[PDB]
Design a protein around this ligand. Structure first.
Ligand SMILES: [K+]
Ligand SMILES: [K+]
Ligand SMILES: [K+]
Ligand SMILES: [Mg+2]
Ligand SMILES: [Mg+2]
Length: 136
RNA sequence: ACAU
DNA sequence: CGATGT
């Protein structure tokens, strides 16, 4: 319908999928970058999208902000709602870091509360989410 | 099919 | 063209 401009938008970026994963959050209205995660050597698109949302929740909670979060990822929105990231990525030495971060994000969801609405960014109607990396 |  | 997900 109408974009809620008073919001936080998040997105993953990658080099390969699976591959190097990063993410960032921006002010939807202005494009100001509010947070960025240092690249993680191996992860998936969906793990990164999940981590981005959870980080947004933690960022907004620490700041006493009731703004919603936009994500373009149907998968990650569902994983956050379920508090469970149902990733197929093998757990081995190479993927230990991304799985550690995912496990820690689930743990945070299971021990904290929030009212933040997590909303689907309607890419087909609005174009790319404002946190996008411009790599496609 | 749809969403990345 | 390849991949990750519901
Ligand atoms: K997109
Ligand atoms: K991109
Ligand atoms: K598919
Ligand atoms: Mg995205
Ligand atoms: Mg993007």
């Amino acid at each position: 319908e109408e974009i809620i401009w008073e919001s936080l938008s998040v997105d993953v970026g990658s080099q390969g999928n699976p591959g190097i994963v990063e993410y960032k959050g921006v002010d939807t209205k202005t494009g100001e970058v509010l947070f960025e995660r240092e690249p993680i050597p191996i992860g998936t698109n969906n793990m990164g999208e999940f981590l981005a949302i959870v980080h947004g929740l933690r960022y907004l909670k620490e700041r006493n902000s009731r703004k919603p979060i936009y994500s373009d990822s149907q998968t990650a929105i569902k994983w956050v709602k379920d508090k469970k990231a149902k990733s197929t990525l093998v757990r081995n030495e190479e993927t230990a870091l991304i799985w550690k971060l995912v496990d820690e994000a689930e743990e945070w969801l299971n021990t904290h509360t929030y009212e933040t609405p997590i909303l689907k960014w309607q890419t087909d109607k609005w174009g790319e989410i404002k946190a996008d990396y411009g790599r496609k």
